[PDB]
Design a protein around this ligand. Sequence first.
Ligand code: KFE
Ligand code: ZN
Length: 1005
Amino acid sequence: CQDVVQDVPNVDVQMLELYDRMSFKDIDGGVWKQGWNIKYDPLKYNAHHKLKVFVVPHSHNDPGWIQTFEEYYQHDTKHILSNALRHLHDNPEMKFIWAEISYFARFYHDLGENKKLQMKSIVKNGQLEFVTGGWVMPDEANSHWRNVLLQLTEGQTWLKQFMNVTPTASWAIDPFGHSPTMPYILQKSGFKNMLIQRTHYSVKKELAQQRQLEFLWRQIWDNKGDTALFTHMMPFYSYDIPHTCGPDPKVCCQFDFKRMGGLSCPWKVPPRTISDQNVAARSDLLVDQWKKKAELYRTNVLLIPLGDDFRFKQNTEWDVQRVNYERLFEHINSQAHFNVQAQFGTLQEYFDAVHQAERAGQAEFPTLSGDFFTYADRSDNYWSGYYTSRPYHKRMDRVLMHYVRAAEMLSAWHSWDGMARIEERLEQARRELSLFQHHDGITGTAKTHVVVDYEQRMQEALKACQMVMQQSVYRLLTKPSIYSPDFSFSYFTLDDSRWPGSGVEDSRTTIILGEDILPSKHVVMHNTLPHWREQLVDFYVSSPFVSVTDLANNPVEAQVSPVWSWHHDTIHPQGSTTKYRIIFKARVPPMGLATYVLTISDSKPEHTSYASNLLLRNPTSLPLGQYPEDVKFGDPREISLRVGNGPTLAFSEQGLLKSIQLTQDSPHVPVHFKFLKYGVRSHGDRSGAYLFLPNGPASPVELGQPVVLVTKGKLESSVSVGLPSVVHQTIMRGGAPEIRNLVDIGSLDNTEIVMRLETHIDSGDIFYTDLNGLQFIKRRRLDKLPLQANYYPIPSGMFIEDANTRLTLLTGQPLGGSSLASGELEIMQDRRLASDDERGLGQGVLDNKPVLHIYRLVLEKVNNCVRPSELHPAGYLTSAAHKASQSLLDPLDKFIFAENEWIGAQGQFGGDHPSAREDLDVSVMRRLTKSSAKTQRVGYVLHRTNLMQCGTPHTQKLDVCHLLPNVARCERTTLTFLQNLEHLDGMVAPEVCPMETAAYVSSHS
Ligand SMILES: O=C(NCCCCCOC[C@]12C[C@H]3C[C@H](C[C@H](C3)C1)C2)[C@H]1N[C@H](CO)[C@H](O)[C@@H]1O
Ligand SMILES: [Zn+2]
């Protein structure tokens, strides 16, 4: 294994370093507004050194944006692919690339057998070429890497099954900035090349000037270059035809043959039919554009994309584009003075030719590390807004992410009879989640009715996962001698205390116990992580006199708290007189299950404690039915609370963290939570779904005298306050506290609510943010850039640190954030914007709705931690912050047995499963084979992160090939499971290096 801490990789372009140098001047460059006037020497080209031009037709199909997936399919995409099939069949030299497999499967499954064979023919002979072949073209800012892999795996498995093809070239023309997570996953999925478009205009200029638009993109920690993927960055403002032929859109627009009027050319010179009369002059103009574009790149091979949104719909558009380009190609190729060979081509064709030029020693390409956030398309129009837009669904993404892993893991242990419909359920679940990864899904940049479609699909997917999980649990914990399933029956319902949140939707079930009817209830906890976990769990119960046992009747220590809900004239808490929370510690095996029993008594049981409740405000009495401890009252004041050995938190009189004492000796380290607001510009560019354009720094929110509720218990205490737009909550269970914000922005139009942390941490201009929950990247605040350019994606966490102290905030949801000054962290909660931001959504964001945001706050000492070089572009979590992220993203699942009685019930599953080192995860367990198959196969994705070593190192070796019994073979595969990289002598899967991801398939006889 490489070391990813001590050795800094040496690369030609390190993006953080480049950002430090660059001046980012927005100077008028001419016809190319954000570059310069390109010059070429015309003697560069001659009969022995010619320009090879690949013109690559394409059609950018959004799986939802202005219309839903199904609306677009019917109005646009089904016509585009019909005409692709007809026109390419008839025109052998004509070519076309296709990215979005969601649309292509929809189409293909509706064809007659004859058309399917014709379609296979134009794919087999290379006319229609799939690029990337993911279900969607995903967002790269907010997306979790697991969901990036999910949507790629889904599209590629479809392509391999139905077209016998796996793309090795990726096409990503539309995501709003680009993550190095993509090459990381692609290069481990058999990919050899990738293309990107939406990078900062100043980055395009800078790289174009050095011919560094094509580069070997490696991970920021990779010394060796094993992760390197050949990347082509397109040079111009857009992927459309005006911005793809060359530097002068006014010329290029004239070679978009669909623009001959109800579309026109903004530059006011229309396209003209190519004729014998004009082909010489038209060709001179176009080749001059081609040759200017070629100056920006190192080979004599030129990529010319030919397409736009939902292009190639009309069969006449196929004609007018194909016929005019043929006449140009016929003239140009027959005229030696051009020294061009021009033809319709595919992306793979382009890349093969570029590597032939490299193999032949005509170019050597520079190395790059870093990301391409935050994207600006012009002036100060930074796309940091979509890091936060529609935060309800951003949260829902992470919840569905977990349920799909748990459903596929739980159901993977057994083959299922097809009458169970496990395969169907999981396919629906994978595809709805995969679709939401689209750059108009998770981004929150779609119209209101499309967001509603995405919500409804994710809701159906969650229900499908629940059905699979509860069937799997009943099977895993019922004696085989009794197990006799009704595949349509709910044996368990799922309890989830964090989605949607009782504050958002009053939807948790009360386990109703009574000494006559239902004295006891079985509950089950699932642990998807491959190590022993001991986590507090809670359930709603109809009486406070409840005791907890394992199935062996060993007593388990519990706490009962009241059920609090918040209400709005003044924002004040009310208690239930009818239901209570039972809280206890579940110990659950690796990738396993543990059963416990909730039992009623007439009175206080031996092993169950009751929290006190203190309501700080001019009081009036609050009953809690049979809850034995009466609510105490009082005036706002400062409070300290501690749970177990874990930290002591001090809170203000408005109920907001002002300090954390780690240990009993150590200091009360200042840590202030405050809510602020950004507004919208009155004159200038308006903030929208995409753009964050604040009218200067955030201004504090008037809290007034808010009602602060304090609940204090042996196992769990919390401080909650009803602030305007936010019920803020700090929960303590004996480690890093958990923060919950119930965010209701109401109709505070032209407002972005932010949450800031103020410390004395001497961070300076340095902060760290993660990319797709895979890696932490060093950010440097740049005073030379406006505020919105210092905002970055916070997909799963952010941190600051000096020589001694670190503060890490972990998120349960992707949101936008920064460190706008030394010892600060801030993360946006929600945004409501009256105005469109003129990127084609055609509305602002006025569909806000209550969301429950969840966080972990890890203050820790790092003076004794081995930290990377001051010159390393990466950061790494501590064990405590990694485990805290794990408790947000993949908590224990909770199952309440539905029936009065459970014959066959067992207490545990997975007792024998290995408990792997804390840095290793089984990201994916997925059975690859239906029952009717003599060889069963199960895929595993193993990720190993890298944690800062702090000199405090109980760990069985995990071999996923020996998890299921009767193994006949073990293969290391691509992360899609679609290719064998080795049959493993030993039938053992070996341990993977820090920051490595590897996939294995185990076979069974
Ligand atoms: O960018 C994308 N598509 C092309 C965009 C066309 C819409 C541009 O309208 C500009 C204006 C229309 C009217 C209202 C105002 C002022 C003028 C008139 C010009 C704005 C792609 N990226 C999108 C991201 O959401 C989407 O995933 C699409 O595939
Ligand atoms: Zn798009």
